């Protein structure tokens, strides 16, 4: 689970100012609901958080109841712990457990929680700059890593978007946490639509290039259930991926080979 950088034939290197972080960082004008309304699950054990009995999957619609499984990951095939196909194709938020439930580390519904489990290697492609590829196979439904950075608000973003988009570098690195909008519305408480920006701090996924026939997709992973306006951004493999293939994903869902190329990005 080490990050390695490789650049064949270019004189470029990572900006000494860029910094790698393990968890996202909230800016100061953003929301943190009281520890007074936090709820995890009492489940005992371990757990048995894979069945509807667990309060973590309430919003998750269905000798006487059933008493069937429902947690959005597979429980026992060679695909155990891989995103259910029902969730891949259907793109419904992933309701995961957290530090508020009577369940531990392996709780089957805490995949994104555990973080990345596959080693990644940033390598220098030739046209699109830096890109990412994995030194080991990744079956479809697999969790690669999540998109991090510094969480901010629509106004302060508007601030950077133009301050930047106008006089200098275009390289956009702002991801919008809008799965819910838107629703519631108103206022409540106180206060009566805030975003994540990782230009100067982030994870490997900060370097994945856009494609129009991606081999990866992003899903929202929710926890506390109050902490959902600032939901995690999970990058899941939507199809099996050989080693050495450059991870990709549609920035909304261009130099991409993709015959289906939507013209440009964003």
């Amino acid at each position: 689970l080490p990050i390695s950088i490789v650049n064949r034939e270019d004189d470029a290197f990572l900006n000494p100012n860029f910094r790698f972080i393990d968890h996202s960082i909230i800016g100061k004008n953003v929301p943190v609901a009281d520890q007074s309304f936090r709820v995890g699950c009492s489940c005992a054990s371990d757990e048995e958080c894979m069945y509807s009995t667990c309060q973590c999957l309430d919003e998750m619609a269905p000798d006487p109841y059933t008493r069937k499984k429902r947690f959005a990951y597979y429980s026992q095939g060679a695909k155990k712990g891989l995103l259910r196909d029902r969730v891949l194709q259907s793109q419904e938020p992933i309701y995961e457990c957290h530090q508020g439930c009577a369940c531990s580390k392996d709780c089957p519904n805490r995949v994104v929680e555990r973080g990345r489990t596959v080693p990644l290697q940033i390598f220098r492609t030739k046209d699109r700059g830096w890109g990412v590829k994995c030194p080991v196979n990744i079956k479809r439904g697999q969790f690669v890593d999540r998109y991090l950075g510094e969480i901010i608000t629509s106004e302060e973003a508007d601030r950077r978007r133009a301050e930047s988009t106008i006089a200098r570098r275009k390289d956009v690195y702002l991801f919008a946490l809008d799965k819910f909008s838107d629703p519631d519305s108103l206022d409540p408480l106180l206060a009566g639509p805030l975003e994540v920006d990782g230009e100067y701090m982030s994870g490997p996924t900060r370097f994945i290039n856009h494609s129009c026939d991606p081999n990866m997709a992003i899903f929202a992973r929710v926890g506390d259930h109050a902490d959902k306006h600032i939901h995690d951004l999970a990058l899941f493999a939507i199809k099996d991926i050989p080693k050495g293939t450059e991870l990709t994903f549609d920035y909304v869902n261009c130099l991409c080979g993709t015959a289906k190329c939507r013209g440009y990005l964003w």
Partner: peptide, 7 residues
């Protein structure tokens, strides 16, 4: 621009 998630 910015990265998003809608439908």
């Amino acid at each position: 621009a910015r990265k998003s998630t809608g439908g």
